[PDB]
Amino acid sequence: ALETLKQAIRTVPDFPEPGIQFKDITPVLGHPELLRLAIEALLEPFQEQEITKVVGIESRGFILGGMLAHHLDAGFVPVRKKGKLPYQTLAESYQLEYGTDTIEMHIDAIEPGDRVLIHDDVIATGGTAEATIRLVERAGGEVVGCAFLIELTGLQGRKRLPAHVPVHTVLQL
Amino acid sequence: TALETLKQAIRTVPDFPEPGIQFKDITPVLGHPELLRLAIEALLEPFQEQEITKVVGIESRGFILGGMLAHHLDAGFVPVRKKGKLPYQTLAESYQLEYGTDTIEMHIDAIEPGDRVLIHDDVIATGGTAEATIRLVERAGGEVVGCAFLIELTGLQGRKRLPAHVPVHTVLQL
Ligand SMILES: Nc1ncnc2c1ncn2[C@@H]1O[C@H](COP(=O)(O)O)[C@@H](O)[C@H]1O
Ligand SMILES: Nc1ncnc2c1ncn2[C@@H]1O[C@H](COP(=O)(O)O)[C@@H](O)[C@H]1O
Ligand SMILES: [Ca+2]
Ligand SMILES: [Ca+2]
């Protein structure tokens, strides 16, 4: 039971765009007792597993993503929306409900043989996490798993991800 | 000399984001577990025993080491962001650039009186953003125990822009 985490999550409708039922985890981030619980819960299924790199998906995935890398004595790799990373990148474009998005990762972020944990605060449709798995694999990384704080269960983002990747979600909202 | 290895790993990318800007890319430090460990240890050396309750990370690139600093210190983490980028109710600080103005924001429930706050960003350049961040934190009632930056662009003299009562620690001078 992780009720203290669940209770702390704020919903802000229409952020950053109308229609999005935004799950704001800043109340968790700001309280060390809850931050501790969140990190422990994210990491639990990955005990005693060699993790070389943690990928944090975009700005809000950098926050717990970095902590995970530090806690695991791993490197940290940012994956970003197109145009945000400074060095040469690999890119993946993907179809949305409406429109398309592109994410990128530095060409030297991941090396063949790296064991990689992919993190984001929230999985919604799973489109971004799917494309991130593709980036990591193109670089020769092996995806040990994805760890999300929150799954938006209604959207069934898990179904968008490939069968071969273990997916851990702490909260089902 | 461990620090010289950090220095050598920093990458400069010309003309990013806007032409003319000499971007300091810290991803080679972030990606290598040994360098990342050294970076965090160096940032925290003056601060480990200071009863810090909150670490502020300034914008996306400050969230990366910023979160690790909070986690390491058993402190809470607070994101500060450009205007409109945070979801909850905010307080805001506008500040002057060389051309025009910028505005940063923080959640109204992020910082309380009594909080002892460390402010982090990967790079300090003009110091405009960190100056405004100090103002935000202070208006919320926090005390800024210090700022910790990985990189100081000493040519831009950002230190001079920060108020004299706030200790400023930088790991690398570039
Ligand atoms: N309701 C939401 N609350 C917070 N973050 C969200 C929400 N929906 C999507 N995101 C984020 O937006 C990006 C797109 O998510 P996805 O639909 O899973 O590809 C990911 O970084 C998600 O974490
Ligand atoms: N040359 C640079 N390389 C990387 N980041 C930078 C550089 N110059 C400024 N920044 C970032 O841009 C923002 C504005 O910096 P400042 O001029 O110190 O207010 C801060 O988040 C800095 O970390
Ligand atoms: Ca360790
Ligand atoms: Ca707002």
Q: Which residues surround ligand 3, an ion (CB under 5 A)?
A: A 73
Shortest CA distance to A91 belongs to which of A106, A78, A76? A106
Residues B23/B11, Cβ–Cβ less than 8 Å: no
Q: Kindly provide the resolution of this structure in angstroms, with one decimal.
A: 1.4
CA pair distance B144, A153, nearest whole angstrom:
40
User: B65 contacts in A (CB within 8 Å)?
Assistant: 66
In SS3 terms, B64-109 reads as HHHHHHHHHCCCEEEEEEECCCCCCCEEEEEEECCCCEEEEEEECC
CA pair distance B79, B77, nearest whole angstrom:
7
In SS3 terms, chain B reads as CHHHHHHHHCEEEECCCCCCCEEEECHHHHHCHHHHHHHHHHHHCCCCCCCCCEEEEEHHHHHHHHHHHHHHCCCEEEEEEECCCCCCCEEEEEEECCCCEEEEEEECCCCCCCCEEEEEEEEECCCHHHHHHHHHHHHCCCEEEEEEEEEECHHHCHHHHCCCCCCEEEEEEC
The amino acid sitting at B143 is E
Residues A74/A55, Cβ–Cβ less than 8 Å: no
Find the helix packing angle between A32-43 and B59-72, rounded to 10°. 90
CA pair distance B26, A109, nearest whole angstrom:
12
| Angle, alpha carbons A160-A162-A164 (nearest 5°) | 150
| Letter string b/e over residues B29-49, b meaning 16 or more CB atoms within 10 A of that residue's CB | bbbbbebbebbbebbbeebee
Residues A100/A128, Cβ–Cβ less than 8 Å: no
- Tokens describing residue B62: 């400050």
Output the CA–CA distances (angstroms, integers) from residue A33 to A17, A147, B74, B124, B146, in the order listed. 31, 20, 8, 30, 23
- Tokens describing residue B83: 């205007």
User: A65 contacts in B (CB within 8 Å)?
Assistant: 64, 67
CA pair distance B60, B121, nearest whole angstrom:
9
CA pair distance A96, B29, nearest whole angstrom:
33
CA pair distance B29, B57, nearest whole angstrom:
18
Residues A103/A82, Cβ–Cβ less than 8 Å: yes
- Tokens describing residue B98: 């060389």
CB atoms near residue B138 (< 10 Å): 17
- Tokens describing residue A93: 């474009």
Q: Contacts by B15-20 with C-beta closer than 8 Å and gap 24+?
A: B16/A86, B17/A86
B72 CA from centroid of ligand 2 (Å):
24
Nearest CA-CA distance, residue A134 and chain B, Å: 19
The experimental technique used to determine this model is X-ray
Pocket of ligand 1 (CB under 6 A): A 20-23, 57-58, 120-129, 152, 157
- Tokens describing residue A3: 């009720």
Q: Is the CB of B126 under 6 A from ligand 2?
A: yes
Q: Which of B4, B49, B51, B98 is catalytic?
A: B98
Q: Which of A3, A48, A60, A137 is catalytic?
A: A60
- Tokens describing residue B9: 């790993």
| Residue in the structure block whose two tokens are 């108020």 | B163
The radius of gyration of chain A's CA atoms, rounded to the nearest angstrom, is 15
Residues A86/B84, Cβ–Cβ less than 8 Å: no
CA pair distance A96, A117, nearest whole angstrom:
24
For β-strands B143-152 and B116-124, DSSP reports them as parallel
Q: Which of A3, A17, A33, A97 is catalytic?
A: A97
Which residue from B minimizes the CA distance to A23? B87
Nearest CA-CA distance, residue B157 and chain A, Å: 24
Residues B33/A75, Cβ–Cβ less than 8 Å: yes
- List of domains in chain A: 1-173 (3.40.50.2020)
Shortest CA distance to B173 belongs to which of B17, B14, B19, B24? B24
B76 Cβ neighbours under 8 A, 6+ residues apart: A29, A30, A31, A32, A35, B53, B54, B55, B70
DSSP string, chain A: --HHHHHH-EEEET-SSTT-EEEE-HHHHT-HHHHHHHHHHHHGGGTT----EEEEEHHHHHHHHHHHHHHTT-EEEEEEETT--SS-EEEEEEE-SSSEEEEEEETTSS-TT-EEEEEEEEESSSHHHHHHHHHHHHTT-EEEEEEEEEE-GGG-GGGGS-TTS-EEEEEE-
Q: How many residues does chain A have?
A: 173
